[PDB]
Amino acid sequence: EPYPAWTADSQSPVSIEQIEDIFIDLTNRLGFQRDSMRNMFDHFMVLLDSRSSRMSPDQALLSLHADYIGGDTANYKKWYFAAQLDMDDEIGFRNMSLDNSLEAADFRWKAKMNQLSPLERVRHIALYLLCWGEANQVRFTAECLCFIYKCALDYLDSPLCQQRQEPMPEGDFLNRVITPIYHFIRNQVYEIVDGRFVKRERDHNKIVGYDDLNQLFWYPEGIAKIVLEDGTKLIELPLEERYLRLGDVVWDDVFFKTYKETRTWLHLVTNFNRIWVMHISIFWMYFAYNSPTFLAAYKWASCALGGTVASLIQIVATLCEWSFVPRKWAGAQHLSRRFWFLCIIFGINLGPIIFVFAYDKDTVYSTAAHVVAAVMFFVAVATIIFFSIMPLGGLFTSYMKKSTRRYVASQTFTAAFAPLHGLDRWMSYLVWVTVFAAKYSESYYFLVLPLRDPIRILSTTAMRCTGEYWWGAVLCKVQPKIVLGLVIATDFILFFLDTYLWYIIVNTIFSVGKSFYLGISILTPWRNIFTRLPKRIYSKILATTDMEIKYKPKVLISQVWNAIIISMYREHLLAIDHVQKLLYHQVPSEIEGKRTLRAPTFFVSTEFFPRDSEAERRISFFAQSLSTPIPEPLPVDNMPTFTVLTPHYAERILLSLREIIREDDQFSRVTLLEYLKQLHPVEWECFVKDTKILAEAPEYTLRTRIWASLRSQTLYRTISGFMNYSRAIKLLYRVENPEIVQMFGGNAEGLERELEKMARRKFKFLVSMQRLAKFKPHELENAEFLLRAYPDLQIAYLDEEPPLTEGEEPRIYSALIDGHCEILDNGRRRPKFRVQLSGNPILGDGKSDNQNHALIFYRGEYIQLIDANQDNYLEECLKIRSVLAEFEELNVEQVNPYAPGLRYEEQTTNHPVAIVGAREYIFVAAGKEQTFGTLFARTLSQIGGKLHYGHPDFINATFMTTRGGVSKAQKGLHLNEDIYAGMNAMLRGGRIKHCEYYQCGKGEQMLSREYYYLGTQLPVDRFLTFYYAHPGFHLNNLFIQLSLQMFMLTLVNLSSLAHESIMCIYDRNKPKTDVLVPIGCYNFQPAVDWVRRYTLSIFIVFWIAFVPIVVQELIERGLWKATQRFFCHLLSLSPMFEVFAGQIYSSALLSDLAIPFSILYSRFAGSAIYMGARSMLMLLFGTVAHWQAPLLWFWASLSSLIFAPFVFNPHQFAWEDFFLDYRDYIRWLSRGNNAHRTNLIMAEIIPCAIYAAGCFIAFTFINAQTGVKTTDDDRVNSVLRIIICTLAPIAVNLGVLFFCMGMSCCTGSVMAGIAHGVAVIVHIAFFIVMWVLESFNFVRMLIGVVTCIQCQRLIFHCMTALMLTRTQPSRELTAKVIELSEFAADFVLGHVILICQLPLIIIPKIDKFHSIMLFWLKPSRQIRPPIYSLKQTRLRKRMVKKYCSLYFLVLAIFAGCIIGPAVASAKIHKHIGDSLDGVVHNLFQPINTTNNDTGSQMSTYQS
Ligand SMILES: OC[C@H]1O[C@@H](O[C@@H]2[C@@H](O)[C@H](O[C@@H]3[C@@H](O)[C@H](O[C@@H]4[C@@H](O)[C@H](O)O[C@H](CO)[C@H]4O)O[C@H](CO)[C@H]3O)O[C@H](CO)[C@H]2O)[C@H](O)[C@@H](O)[C@@H]1O
Ligand SMILES: CCCCCCCCCC(=O)O[C@H](COC(=O)CCCCCCC)COP(=O)(O)OCCN
Ligand SMILES: CCCCCCCCCCCCCC
Ligand SMILES: CCCCCCCCCCCC
Ligand SMILES: CCCCCCCCCCCC
Ligand SMILES: CCCCCCCCCCCC
Ligand SMILES: CCCCCCCCCC
Ligand SMILES: CCCCCCCCCC
Ligand SMILES: CCCCCCCCCC
Ligand SMILES: CCCCCCCCCC
Ligand SMILES: CCCCCCCCCC
Ligand SMILES: CCCCCCCCCC
Ligand SMILES: CCCCCCCCC
Ligand SMILES: CCCCCCCCC
Ligand SMILES: CCCCCCCCC
Ligand SMILES: CCCCCCCCC
Ligand SMILES: CCCCCCCCC
Ligand SMILES: CCCCCCCCC
Ligand SMILES: CCCCCCCCC
Ligand SMILES: CCCCCCC
Ligand SMILES: CCCCCCC
Ligand SMILES: CCCCCCC
Ligand SMILES: CCCCCCC
Ligand SMILES: CCCCCCC
Ligand SMILES: CCCCCCC
Ligand SMILES: CCCCCCC
């Protein structure tokens, strides 16, 4: 018997016979495929059965007609009111507010659909379904389908076609109006070569995709660009004669690009322009206030000048946005009409300032110069507030004239955000008001106020040196100012980290506080969740409130709790003597003889679960998750149907048999069977017990296959353990209604058949086996076994068939095979349906296409789309009637969507819910426990919303199918393949909520076109919430790294200034003896104290935003480790010990986010090492020149970043694997061998030149002698040293290369060997010559080496960029030179690293310790080869002993290169060399001069 909720009622308007005739009529008179008509007829009736199972059929049909075409929710009405009768701006106006006109048409539409007959509505819905089920891959472009549907309906509703009596040929709709569009889509890629298709290589800015292809149908002036074959526009023809000529149009003169994304940094200035306005514009005022050194009017005038900057960003953003949209495409006049209103505000804000600034000096105008400057400070505060609110894409729009288009993007498909009202609307303002209040309040007292003394000191004090030779002392006189500039600049980036710092705190405080105020899970009443289980199971899993005959509320709970436990036992998770204490036992009544129900001892108040196993983990969560409020479920006779999708490219259905044993000692450990036995050694015993009991053969082989496949990672386990929905639905049905059992008691087969029939009508499984036609003969047997095991599965695959005639592409179908179909002699089943596609439906590279070709067969109302590896245990598979109630449609009352009056302000179902994610974060003794809970909460709140925006689990099919698909992938767009659907269903109108009582079971997109639609149009609270989660987290990790390279550049300048000064001794209590006791000195102690207050605040932002993830990634073990650490540090150094222990976290994180030395070192060089060395030399110079106390907190961090990958290797430190690794390293080193274009050159040259000038300036000043009291004609001429020590090694390399080329002209291994040998030695010797030139002074030599390295790097980069921007011998010279120079660095830098491990090998036994530590870290299927005989042992010892001598000789050479000048610095006691006229005092003039010219001396000049 057929669909029983529509066909078996006496109130349905139309019968199935009158429904099938309509589907046959349209097929006959339009040419739809016969197998697609038979498919959509079943999909339309299943969808009408379920929705009519909880209401009346007369209302079910109306609700279906109001959700596909015609209601306020349907996408067709929204397209009709926006691209067929204009009226796009009147929709944006209404949304902002929350004869022609708008009501005069909305009322007409609403009163026209109200007088339709039930037999006339079916004809409307079927026409949409038949088009949607056949237009392949045009489903990604929703609007094309609406246009085609309108054309077809117009043709069918004209009286002319009625007289014609010959029907269109079959397969016409596909070969005539759908195939040209697909041919256009495919040809934008995949150029044809001689025989096949290959990926055409072209710039990713001339490739139109689906987003550009469907965007043409949003405007009436976009629809009017369709040109036919002959040349005329398509609008000329009448409405009725427009469908026939729809195959003549050429889709190549009609489609354009419409976004055209540019460079990356040009997008961030115009998308998030409300973050650069409320930070920079206030950082200006804060400093301009307390900086009098550049009266009282000038103070307010210079503070109010910060309203000009708050408008300059708003001008430079509109100017950048001018280069995204096309020229004349709708939404361009608004840019030009807004650029001329921004200039007026800029002019007004800059006007009176020019007056007040330069018209005040000692004239009679003080009366009218303070009033004009006090009002500008209040005008330039209105501008800052008005530009931090009021989205960029929507301001100055009320005042605009009619024009044509008022907005820049469509306000009905790009901006329809759900209002989010209720209580969250009020709790969303508070979170941001408090955050910004706290940030702006404490960022002024601890970051800007204590910086007003160094500003006054450093801006006035002047130096006295001799100076250089080409520019005298003009550069050494203004040093303090150069230091002050860098100090402010590096404190402008630390102003952006603070606001992300406060967002973490104020978002955890609210979560904890509200979860306490709601009283859910207060403290931890652990013996309460188990205490009251039955009352919760009787009201949250059974729908008894509408079942009546209230009787025996314990037998039902008994049945449910017995089944849930017996299943766990059957999975071999509990012992047989263990389940007896954990089950509802029934015992006969000794009083009379009747029956009695008992309860478990576990369950009223002893190894209840074995050693905190998976059984404990599951029964804990199941009982703990019923506390949270859960909506009341419906009876199992009224729940809607649903479906499960799963893709499959190439996975393993089963373990085979050769793969289970194989060979043992050729990989890790032994055979996989014994591996699994060792991993889980109790259920193997349960399995063998059951096998013996059954045996009380190949089938044993099959059972072993099954037992292995349920473990490891296959596709059979997902299907086997994910089909528990069927068992749950049968169990709930039989438990709920007992009368059905008694009517035919004694017929177990009949009862089973009834239950199966009911549970087969409410759950469908669908797996999309792509490329099933070309499986191997062994691989197809597993697929054939799946259908035999479960005779209700459904598979969809891509068939194929030879072309009709030679020369054309083959025709490929799309087929579905069930498990109840009859088998053929070929060994394959007859497909139930076969729909012809229009070509290879795979053009991308993701899984989107595979999900798309099989989305036709999705019968139901909701979809759970899963991955290829899921668990979904049975206990969490029982509350499926409650998670489907999040889609709040099950308990409502229908209100006849079409009705007179009731305008669109007082409706309720306006924003339906689209996606429903699942709960993804899986979890003084009392004080320690509370602190641990708070730390876990803080760790969760980091990803409480970060990874939870659009991760989809359930999908509203009706909503997310008529507009786009379930997910999209293309070469053009690139979001995440998984975050696109959730971020695109939010700005079409839908909502996104998520349940928290369900276990799931599991930048390059800054250039997207949806960040542009979101960050330019969202309201303020929503924009801040969106920004500080996805883009803000990625953009924060770039500021932390950028604010640690600006610090090393100011430390060098500020420590090269404290090394040549007297410093005016200063006490930090009350140093107001304003005589500056060393008399004549200049005090820099407050400036030097700034370093102490920066290291303190750069580690707070580290111990709150990077350490809490150690809990997440170390929750494996560490409770006992923490207990042991507390025991071993109960009376230790306390804070000092904790601080020193706060260094292993960086190493752990680095190694976790991170083996031969060659590969290990080459994988990290260029990302953490090449920067580490250059940032370590600078720190060494800084810590040698002045040695501030809080500077060794950087040494640990920089030393634990380049030593982490080399400490967590399995076997490295023993004695000889090290030397074999060294052998391999040496061999590899010997044979290693490694305005449209003005942005490429400046992308990587400007920051590499500023960083070089910053070091050159610091190097010149330390040589420029100060306080020396000499004559003018001394100077130092220190510039020439840099030129000598920079370009000379390049000259030597080039000369050697030329000489060796000539010698080859008149066995290249020796060539390379000698070249490398001289290249290393030249750099090592010119390291020494720079030390010699500075008269053997270490401190003023380190800064000479660093600047030489920087200048060489700059030269190489610029030369490479030039030689590739703009001759072949020149190329083969420059490339070789660059490689030969970089080889010396690659030979020195790593080789030093490998020397520092020398003292860590002399330990008599270290490998045992290291192995113990790494094994505690994790075991990984260990292995140890005992393959050792005399011959190779002798060879091993020979080679190991032979290379140790070279390893301890290179170390001696390096040590003798350093100790030499350190002992040769004593014998020499005079100046070295005397020259004149441009090289005078070339080496370094002073040998015994002093720089302490302080004391009673009253007036001296010493120029
Ligand atoms: O790229 C995608 C993935 O990015 C992952 O995050 C890493 C990010 O951690 C890395 O930044 C580090 C810096 O953190 C490090 O500076 C240290 C500070 O973090 C700390 O607070 O203070 C010490 C003081 O010594 C600093 O050294 O410096 C290194 C040096 O390069 C940076 O790498 O940057 C990576 C590339 O930008 C980035 O990938 C993220 O966790 C993943 O989720 C993401 O997929
Ligand atoms: C005194 C001895 C050393 C002489 C060093 C000669 C460098 C000669 C020039 C060069 O090689 O400079 C850089 C490499 O700098 C470095 O190794 C700096 C670290 C040096 C540590 C020395 C410790 C004693 C090239 O960097 P890249 O262009 O590779 O960076 C972009 C990514 N590819
Ligand atoms: C007003 C603030 C200006 C900030 C400019 C920052 C420039 C940084 C240049 C150096 C970056 C690191 C180069 C290795
Ligand atoms: C009743 C009006 C409430 C307005 C709330 C605005 C919140 C703005 C937060 C960010 C300010 C910079
Ligand atoms: C009159 C002397 C003015 C000197 C200004 C120096 C500014 C340095 C800015 C550095 C930014 C990275
Ligand atoms: C009036 C003298 C100006 C001297 C040149 C200053 C250049 C500053 C560049 C700073 C780079 C970090
Ligand atoms: C001050 C912010 C202006 C935009 C900064 C962009 C940083 C990333 C560039 C790649
Ligand atoms: C925008 C310039 C405003 C000039 C005001 C002058 C006032 C003069 C009062 C005597
Ligand atoms: C929420 C705190 C707002 C500012 C409180 C007062 C700060 C000090 C004013 C003197
Ligand atoms: C809400 C945090 C406010 C912090 C105020 C810091 C200054 C306290 C008074 C000096
Ligand atoms: C002169 C002070 C030196 C302090 C130690 C510098 C080297 C530290 C290596 C960890
Ligand atoms: C952990 C290493 C500590 C080194 C201290 C160096 C002190 C130098 C004082 C001049
Ligand atoms: C001295 C600073 C006063 C306040 C500046 C404007 C703050 C706007 C939120
Ligand atoms: C500082 C102003 C930059 C403006 C860039 C305009 C780019 C147009 C292609
Ligand atoms: C003494 C009269 C001063 C009036 C100032 C008016 C300023 C208007 C912007
Ligand atoms: C001399 C002090 C004048 C202060 C004027 C304040 C005006 C506020 C709108
Ligand atoms: C001088 C103290 C200024 C404090 C400003 C607080 C602003 C809160 C929005
Ligand atoms: C960036 C936050 C700095 C917080 C400093 C607090 C200092 C307390 C003594
Ligand atoms: C203000 C944005 C541009 C900054 C200079 C160019 C940076 C290129 C990496
Ligand atoms: C801090 C900006 C100063 C502007 C006035 C300079 C004369
Ligand atoms: C534009 C800010 C400075 C004005 C100076 C006028 C002399
Ligand atoms: C001196 C008071 C400091 C309070 C800090 C609160 C975060
Ligand atoms: C005469 C000035 C020469 C400057 C050279 C800078 C590298
Ligand atoms: C005194 C001139 C300005 C110095 C600071 C610029 C950031
Ligand atoms: C905030 C400006 C950053 C410029 C340098 C980017 C590498
Ligand atoms: C005459 C001033 C020259 C400055 C050079 C800075 C690199």
What gap in Å lies between CA 1389 and CA 1398, rounded to an integer? 16
Binding site membership of 1216 for ligand 10 (Cβ less than 6 Å)? no
The residues near 596 (Cβ < 8 Å, ≥ 6 apart) are 586, 587, 588, 589
Q: Alpha-carbon distance 268 to 845, whole Å?
A: 28
- Residue whose CA is closest, atom 12 of ligand 2? 1353
What is the full DSSP assignment across 89-108? HHHHHHHHH---SSHHHHHH
- Cα torsion angle, 1398, 1399, 1400, 1403, sign: positive
Straight-line distance from the first to the last Cα atom of the chain, in angstroms, rounded to the nearest whole number: 111
Q: SS3 letters for 1178-1198?
A: HHHHHHHHCCCHHHHHHHHHH
| SS3 letters across 436-452 | HHHHHHHCCCCCCHHHC
Beta-carbon contacts of residue 1483 (< 8 Å; ≥ 6 apart): 1332, 1333, 1334, 1335, 1471, 1472, 1473
Q: Which of 708, 978, 712, 710 is nearest to 866 (CA)?
A: 978
Q: How many angstroms does the Cα of residue 143 sit away from the middle of ligand 22?
A: 58
Pocket of ligand 4 (CB under 6 A): 278, 388, 429, 432-433, 436, 1020-1021
In our burial notation (b when 16+ CB lie closer than 10 A, e otherwise), range 1288-1302 reads ebbebbeebbeebee
User: SS3 of 918, please?
Assistant: strand
Our CA angle for 18, 20, 24, nearest 5°, is 120
Give the ligand with the smallest distance to the CA of 324: 14
**How do strand 642-648 and strand 862-865 relate by DSSP bridges?**
parallel
CA distance 1139 to 1142: 5
Distance (Å, rounded) from C-alpha 501 to C-alpha 1028?
Answer: 11
- The residues pairing with 994 across neighbouring beta strands, listed in sequence order, are 917
Q: Give the Cα separation of 923 and 218 in Å (integer).
A: 47
Q: What is the residue with the minimal CA distance to atom 10 of ligand 7?
A: 265
In the chain, % helix, strand, coil (3-state, to 5) comes to: 50, 5, 45
How many other CB atoms sit within 10 Å of the CB of residue 904? 12
Looking at residue 1448, its amino acid is: F
80-108: buried (b, 16+ CB within 10 Å) or exposed (e) per residue?
bbbbeeebbbbbbeeeeeeeeeeeeebee
Query: 423 phi and psi, to 5 degrees?
Result: -100, -30
Six-digit token string for 208: 């139109």
What does the alpha-carbon distance between residue 783 and residue 827 come to, in Å, rounded to a whole number? 12
The alpha carbon of 496 and the centre of ligand 25 are apart by a number of angstroms equal to 13
Ligand nearest to the CA of 443: 18
**Amino acid identity, residue 392?**
L
Exposure class string for 830-866: b at 16+ Cβ within 10 A, else e: ebbbbbbbbbbbbbbeebbbbbbbbbbbbbbbbbbbb
Q: How far apart are CA 664 and CA 671, in angstroms?
A: 5
The CA distance from 158 to 659, in Å, is: 67
Ligand 7 atom with the smallest distance to the CA of 280 is 1
What is the DSSP secondary structure assignment for residue 169, as one 8-state letter?
A: P
Report CA(1017)–ligand 7 centroid distance (Å). Answer: 21
Residue nearest atom 7 in ligand 20 by C-alpha distance: 294
Q: Is the CB of 1250 under 6 A from ligand 26?
A: no
How many beta carbons lie within 10 A of that of residue 1053, not counting itself? 20
* Ligand 5 pocket list (CB less than 6 A): 478, 481-482, 485-486, 489
| C-alpha to C-alpha distances, 156 to 29, 240, 248, 1041, nearest whole angstrom | 9, 8, 20, 65
CA separation, residue 1470 to residues 36, 37, 1221, 1487 (Å): 101, 104, 49, 7
Ligand 24 test: best mutation among 478, 483, 484, most atoms within 8 Å of CB? 484
The DSSP letter of residue 543 is -
Residue 689 amino acid letter: K
Distant-in-sequence, close-in-space partners of 1073: CB < 8 Å, separation ≥ 6: none
* Closest atom, ligand 14, to C-alpha of 266: 5
Q: For 1041, how many CA atoms within 13 A lie in the half-sphere containing its CB? A: 9
DSSP 865: E
844 within ligand 8 shell (Cβ under 6 A) = no
Rounded Cα distance, 1119 and 929, in Å: 11
- In the DSSP assignment, the letter for residue 829 is B
- Does residue 1170 line the site of ligand 3, with CB under 6 A? no
Phi and psi at 865, nearest 5°, equal -100, 115
Asked whether 982 and 992 are in contact (CB, 8 A), the reply is yes
Secondary structure of residue 279 in the 3-state scheme = coil
Cβ atoms of residues 198 and 191 within 8 Å: yes
Q: Which amino acid, 112?
A: K
Q: Nearest CA to 1413 among 1117, 1046, 1104, 1070?
A: 1117
Q: How far is the CA of 843 from the centre of ligand 26 (A)?
A: 57
Residue 813 is inside which H or E element, if any?
strand 813-817
| Residue 905 · residue 598 · CB < 8 Å | no
The answer to whether 683 touches 576, Cβ cutoff 8 Å, is: no
> Which residues on adjacent β-strands are paired with residue 797?
815
E-assigned strands of 141-228?
A: 191-192, 197-198
Rounded to the nearest angstrom, the gap between the alpha carbon of residue 38 and the centroid of all alpha carbons in its chain is 43
Please tell me whether residue 814 adopts helix, strand or coil conformation.
strand
Q: What is the largest CA-CA distance in the chain?
A: 127
Distance in Å, CA 433 to ligand 4 centroid: 7
CA of 1094 to the centre of ligand 10 (A): 19
Q: Residue 222: helix, strand or coil by DSSP?
A: helix
Q: Can you tell me the distance from the alpha carbon of 1156 to that of 1162, in angstroms, rounded to the nearest whole number?
A: 10
CA distance 1202 to 1281: 32
Nearest to 1205 by CA among 1386, 1393, 1395, 1042: 1393
Mutation test of ligand 15: which of 372, 377, 378 has the most ligand atoms closer than 8 Å to its C-beta?
Answer: 372
Ligand nearest to the CA of 354: 21
Number of neighbouring beta carbons within 10 Å of residue 475: 16
Q: Tell me if 1253 CB under 6 Å of ligand 6.
A: yes
Q: Of all protein residues, whose CA lies closest to atom 8 belonging to ligand 10?
A: 442
Q: Is 352 in the pocket of ligand 8 (CB under 6 A)?
A: yes
For ligand 19, atom 4, name the residue with the nearest CA. Answer: 265
The helix (H) or strand (E) run that includes residue 1448 is helix 1430-1463
Local structure of residue 823 (DSSP, 8 states): B
| Cα–Cα dist 1189/61, whole Å | 79
Please report the sign of the dihedral spanned by the C-alpha atoms of residue 1018, residue 1021, residue 1022, residue 1026: positive
- Burial class of residue 272 in the structure, from the number of CB atoms within 10 Å of its CB (0-12 exposed, 13-18 middle, 19+ buried): buried
| Ligand closest to CA 1239 | 19
The approach used to solve this structure was cryo-EM
Tell me, rounded to whole angstroms, the distance of Cα 235 from its chain centroid.
45
For residues 26 and 32, the answer to whether their CB atoms sit within 8 Å is yes
The helix/strand/coil state of 847 is coil
Q: What is the DSSP string of 1234-1282?
A: ---STTTTTSSSHHHHHHHHHHHHHHHHHHS-BS----SS-----HHHH
Q: Which of 1374, 1328, 1323, 1325 is nearest to 1349 (CA)?
A: 1323
Kindly provide the resolution of this structure in angstroms, with one decimal. Answer: 3.5
d(CA 1235, CA 1218): 54
The secondary structure element, H or E, covering residue 570 is helix 555-570
Q: Give the residue, out of 262, 264, 269, 313, with the most ligand 7 atoms within 8 A of its beta carbon, to mutate for a pocket test.
A: 269
Is residue 11 within 6 Å of ligand 10 at its C-beta?
Answer: no
- Vertex 1049 angle, CA 453 and 444, to 5°: 35
Sheet containing 913-919, strands listed edge to edge, beginning at the edge strand earlier in sequence: 833-836, 813-817, 795-797, 764-769, 642-648, 862-865, 954-956, 913-919, 991-999
Helix (H) or strand (E) run with residue 685 in it: helix 683-695
Q: Please give the DSSP secondary-structure letter assigned to residue 913.
A: E
Nearest Cα residue to 408 out of 309, 311, 339? 339
Amino acid occupying residue 985? A
Torsion sign (Cα): 1302, 1303, 1306, 1307? negative
Sequence-distant contacts of 1351-1359: CB under 8 A, at least 24 apart: 1351/1252, 1351/1256, 1351/1282, 1351/1286, 1352/1286, 1352/1290, 1352/1381, 1353/1248, 1353/1252, 1354/1245, 1354/1248, 1354/1249, 1354/1252, 1355/1286, 1355/1290, 1356/1381, 1356/1382, 1357/1244, 1357/1245, 1357/1248, 1358/1245
Q: Are 150 and 223 in contact (CB under 8 A)?
A: no
Q: Other C-beta atoms within 10 Å of 1440: how many? A: 17
User: Which ligand is located closest to the Cα atom of residue 455?
Assistant: 24
- Backbone dihedral region of 411: left (phi > 0), alpha (psi from -120 to 50 degrees) or beta? alpha
Report in angstroms the alpha-carbon separations of 1309 from 624, 1232, 1314: 71, 12, 9
- Which 8-state DSSP code applies to residue 383? H
| Cβ–Cβ < 8 Å for 288, 302 | yes
**Distance between CA 1157 and CA 1212 in Å, rounded?**
10
Q: Can you tell me the distance from the alpha carbon of 746 to that of 899, in angstroms, rounded to the nearest whole number?
A: 54
* The token pair that represents 423 in the structure block: 């209580």
198 strand-pairing partners: 191
- The region that residue 803 occupies, defined by phi over 0 for left and psi between -120 and 50 for alpha, beta otherwise, is beta
Q: How many other CB atoms are found less than 10 A from the CB of residue 960? A: 22
Write down the number of H helices and E strands in the chain. 63, 13
- The residues near 423 (Cβ < 8 Å, ≥ 6 apart) are none
What is the DSSP pairing of strand 642-648 with strand 764-769?
parallel
* Gap from CA of 910 to ligand 4 centroid (Å): 26
Tokens of 95: 């949304």
What Rg, from alpha-carbon coordinates, does the chain have?
A: 39
Say which residues have a Cβ less than 8 Å from residue 187's Cβ, sequence separation at least 6.
Answer: none
Query: If you measure from the C-alpha of residue 1094 to the centroid of ligand 22, how many angstroms do you get, rounded to a whole number?
Result: 18
Q: Count CB neighbours of 758 within 10 A.
A: 17
Q: Which of 66, 105, 118 is CA-nearest to residue 907?
A: 66
Residue 1164 identity: F
User: Residue 44 has which token pair?
Assistant: 């339309």
Name the H helices within 490-532.
Answer: 494-517, 526-529
| CB distance 433 to ligand 9 below 6 Å | no
Angstrom distance (rounded) from CA 1501 to CA 1503:
6
Whether the CB of 355 sits within 6 Å of ligand 8: yes
Taking the CA of residue 316 as reference, the ligand 14 atom at the shortest distance is: 2
Q: Take atom 10 of ligand 8 and give the residue whose Cα is closest.
A: 368
CA of 927 to the centre of ligand 22 (A): 22
* Preceding-residue numbers of gaps in the chain (C–N over 2.5 Å): 98, 294, 605, 696, 923, 1002, 1154, 1234, 1306, 1366
* Pocket around ligand 13 at a 6 A CB cut-off: 282, 285, 289, 381, 384
Contact present, 623 and 533 (Cβ < 8 Å): yes
Residues contacting residue 230 through CB under 8 Å, at least 6 positions apart: 248
Atom number in ligand 15 closest to CA 371: 5
Amino acid at 787: L
